């Protein structure tokens, strides 16, 4: 069903947006060395590239 996937994806979008903002606040308080380090933790845990974590964070600032 299309409307149920849309309802589910949008709900997870609102929840995941909260965690991106918290990760942003942790990154905004970190030194440039720690910012790279935090992006490498998230990438190594989630199984993505460190650059993808930054592109995902970019899409949740607007």
Domain ranges for the chain, please list them: 2-58
In this structure, are residues 4 and 44 in contact, taking their beta carbons and an 8 Å threshold?
no
Structure tokens at 12: 């997870």
Cβ neighbours of residue 47 closer than 8 Å, sequence gap 6 or more: none
In this structure, are residues 30 and 42 in contact, taking their beta carbons and an 8 Å threshold?
no
Cα Dmax for the chain: 45
Q: Helix, strand or coil for residue 62? A: coil
- How far is the C-alpha of 33 from the C-alpha of 22, rounded, in Å? 19
Closest CA to 40 of 32, 29, 19, 18: 32
State the resolution, in angstroms.
Answer: 2.4
Q: How many residues does the chain have?
A: 62
User: How determined?
Assistant: X-ray
């Amino acid at each position: 069903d299309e409307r149920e996937i849309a309802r589910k994806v949008a709900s997870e979008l609102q929840k995941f947006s909260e965690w991106v903002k918290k990760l942003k606040e942790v990154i905004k308080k970190a030194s440039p060395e720690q910012q790279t380090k935090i992006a490498q933790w998230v990438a190594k845990l989630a199984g993505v590239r460190p650059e993808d974590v930054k592109k995902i964070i970019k899409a949740f600032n607007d």
